[PDB]
Amino acid sequence: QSVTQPDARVTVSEGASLQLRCKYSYSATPYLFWYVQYPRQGLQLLLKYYSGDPVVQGVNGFEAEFSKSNSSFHLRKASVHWSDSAVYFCAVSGFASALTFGSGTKVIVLPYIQN
């Protein structure tokens, strides 16, 4: 139905937290998703919410919470890895609805360098 990703880009150092904002529009029961696009590959599903517990855990430390009250589906990760650089897309759906995508959010991760 409708999804909004208010930030187009995010720059962050390896080790720090990350929050990618997503707002949705619907009235019914929404099906929510996060997809990730790594360089030189197609979209992949990162996490999804259909029902039950609003906090959903996806691959590699990624988390998202469905909030009906706040009508949000913010994605978070406690400590980002350098390989997390990518474009993240929020999408929404429903019982008799098509899948709709947001404009996406580019995440640039600065790698941590030691000696």
Ligand SMILES: *[C@@H]1O[C@H](CO)[C@@H](O)[C@H](O)[C@H]1NC(C)=O
């Ligand atoms: C909804 O927003 C309120 C006010 O900032 C906040 O206290 C609450 O935790 C939010 N719910 C979500 C999306 O976690």
